Write an enzyme that holds these catalytic residues in place. Structure first.
Site, short mmCIF file in Angstrom:
data_model
loop_
_atom_site.label_atom_id
_atom_site.label_comp_id
_atom_site.label_asym_id
_atom_site.label_seq_id
_atom_site.Cartn_x
_atom_site.Cartn_y
_atom_site.Cartn_z
N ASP A 3 38.36 88.67 24.76
CA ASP A 3 36.76 88.36 23.53
C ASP A 3 37.35 90.49 23.36
OD1 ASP A 3 35.99 86.21 23.74
OD2 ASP A 3 34.63 87.03 25.40
N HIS B 46 34.50 72.20 31.27
CA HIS B 46 34.80 71.72 30.32
C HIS B 46 36.12 72.05 29.67
CE1 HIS B 46 34.17 70.05 25.72
NE2 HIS B 46 33.27 69.67 26.54
N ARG C 94 22.41 79.70 24.33
CA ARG C 94 23.02 78.78 23.97
C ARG C 94 22.73 77.53 25.15
NH1 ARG C 94 27.49 80.67 20.01
NH2 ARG C 94 27.51 81.81 22.25
N1 DGP Z 1 38.11 76.20 19.85
C1 DGP Z 1 37.69 75.17 19.96
N2 DGP Z 1 36.46 74.93 20.32
C2 DGP Z 1 35.72 73.83 21.14
C3 DGP Z 1 36.77 72.53 20.88
N3 DGP Z 1 36.16 71.53 20.42
C4 DGP Z 1 34.51 72.25 21.02
N4 DGP Z 1 34.68 73.40 21.12
C5 DGP Z 1 33.96 74.27 21.81
C6 DGP Z 1 33.13 74.14 22.93
C7 DGP Z 1 32.47 76.15 23.11
O1 DGP Z 1 32.19 76.05 24.26
C8 DGP Z 1 32.71 76.41 21.71
C9 DGP Z 1 32.96 77.64 21.36
O2 DGP Z 1 31.76 78.26 20.66
P1 DGP Z 1 31.88 79.47 20.66
O3 DGP Z 1 31.46 80.64 22.05
O4 DGP Z 1 30.64 80.65 19.67
O5 DGP Z 1 33.42 80.27 20.43
O6 DGP Z 1 33.16 75.40 20.69
C10 DGP Z 1 37.77 72.74 19.83
O7 DGP Z 1 38.84 71.48 19.94
N5 DGP Z 1 38.43 74.03 19.88
#
Ligand code: DGP
Ligand code: DGP
Ligand code: AMP
Ligand code: MG
Ligand code: MG
Lengths: 241, 231
Positions: A15, A206, A68
């Site tokens: 990050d 996950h 979140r």
């Molecule tokens: N990059 C990505 N994120 C995913 C996918 N499926 C679900 N996510 C979800 C799980 C993560 O906790 C979230 C990422 O949100 P963030 O922390 O705002 O970048 O997106 C996917 O195929 N690719």
């Protein structure tokens, strides 16, 4: 323009790199999870519409001064309802394989077969509903796992195609979490940079919370020191390219 | 899966090259103009139904035992309704920037600006309307020049990603005719291969592969085999 895909588990320094690059270079950013957050913020507003449920905006989905993981106390039914509106929204950005949207005066709904998989996938999830769990459900449990494994890479491509001929030095995709998505990035000529903290992991079970394989060609910034040392490693990796 | 974009002028042997690969390797083929003919064929059935017009199937739009230079004797007014229907077809594949399709009781229609924009564009086409001209009108006069430069490459990007884990060795796009589209192809990691004849085409940039078709078909075949060996 150079296409860079960053890879790193939570708190690896990935990050920081992302942010270092965005502020010290001419760069444009694209979040694979961008449209997921957009779809949810739109679905929420539709659900919580004329309710007494908390008003969660895009900023909250962005986690901007919002936790979140905060339990939202939702029932599987509400969630199914939300997932269905999210789909209606997304289907409008780019068609989801096997989903059709029907209208009954401002009331959009998905075809039964798609409504049935959403239902089935959601009923099988016993976790508590946080803004975070809904992102994972929408993106991975539903879309990647059951509708189109490449959907988020596809929306990325549509963005990239509108932007590749512009005056930016770099185009950065900071949040890839699935290997098959890294595979497509690589096929497309992206430079993949892994930011690694010697022997470290992210607390999420996950598969979107686990660490991706370094394949050859992959560059790697080992974050094993100071912040200044991270910044130098980043300046020197980029100069190479 | 190796992404290959073929480049070459009429009779350079570019089509012979696409064929030989399709015939000899594990390859899938995609035409940037595929969707253009699919939408025209769709928008046609819808229109030529009402009328006492000939029947144009997707097989004639392909030019299968049909001449696309043929004049269909269309009014600028029929071309505009045809075009608006093709836009409705396309929008369901991928949103055309600034176009909205509304149902009118078994009548999808495009928002008014898009509608007017089509009107003005079609209104200055002083040519006679054949299948071939409907394709350029749709593909270039309208979409590429007035709505989205990259729309046909976007549709390719969607199909390519779909076929990504399919076990095909090559993904061949043989019909690019615009340089901005080749730029997009290069931005997506495609290898550009030009098929040229010794003694006005797309530019050969650094990194592009060039196969000079100076000998026999079989010499051409051999050059192809060795070129694919190196990617
Ligand atoms: N990059 C990505 N994120 C995913 C996918 N499926 C679900 N996510 C979800 C799980 C993560 O906790 C979230 C990422 O949100 P963030 O922390 O705002 O970048 O997106 C996917 O195929 N690719
Ligand atoms: N590759 C490409 N073809 C286009 C574009 N706009 C129109 N075309 C059409 C016009 C040609 O007659 C056609 C080829 O179709 P065909 O004869 O069926 O192989 O490609 C465009 O932007 N790119
Ligand atoms: N190198 C070659 N030697 C002999 N005949 C050739 C050669 N290249 C192409 N041809 C002929 O040229 C035709 C037209 O080329 P094209 O439509 O560009 O594929 C073919 O159908 C071939 O019979
Ligand atoms: Mg809706
Ligand atoms: Mg229609």
């Amino acid at each position: 323009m150079k296409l860079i895909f960053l890879s790193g588990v939570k708190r690896s320094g990935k990050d920081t790199t992302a942010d270092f690059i965005m502020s010290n270079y001419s760069a444009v950013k694209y979040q694979l999870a961008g449209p997921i957050k957009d779809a949810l913020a739109y679905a929420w507003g539709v659900f919580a519409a004329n309710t007494d449920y908390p008003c969660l905006t895009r900023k909250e989905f962005e986690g901007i001064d919002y936790d979140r993981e905060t339990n939202l106390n939702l029932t599987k039914l509400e969630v199914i309802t939300i997932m269905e509106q999210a789909f209606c929204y997304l289907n409008g950005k780019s068609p989801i394989k096997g989903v059709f949207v029907f209208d009954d005066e401002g009331k959009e709904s998905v075809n039964f077969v798609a409504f049935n998989k959403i239902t089935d996938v959601i009923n099988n999830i016993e976790d508590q509903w946080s803004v975070r769990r809904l992102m994972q459900a929408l993106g991975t449990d539903l879309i990647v796992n059951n509708f189109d494994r490449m959907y988020w890479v596809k929306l990325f491509a549509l963005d990239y195609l509108d932007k590749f001929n512009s005056g930016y030095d770099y185009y950065i995709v900071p949040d890839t979490r699935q290997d098959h998505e890294m595979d497509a990035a690589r096929a497309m000529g992206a430079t993949v940079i892994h930011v690694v903290r010697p022997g470290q992991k992210s607390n999420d079970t996950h598969i979107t919370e686990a660490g991706l394989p370094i394949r050859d060609g992959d560059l790697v910034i080992t974050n094993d020191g100071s912040l200044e040392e991270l910044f130098s490693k980043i300046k020197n990796t980029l100069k190479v390219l």
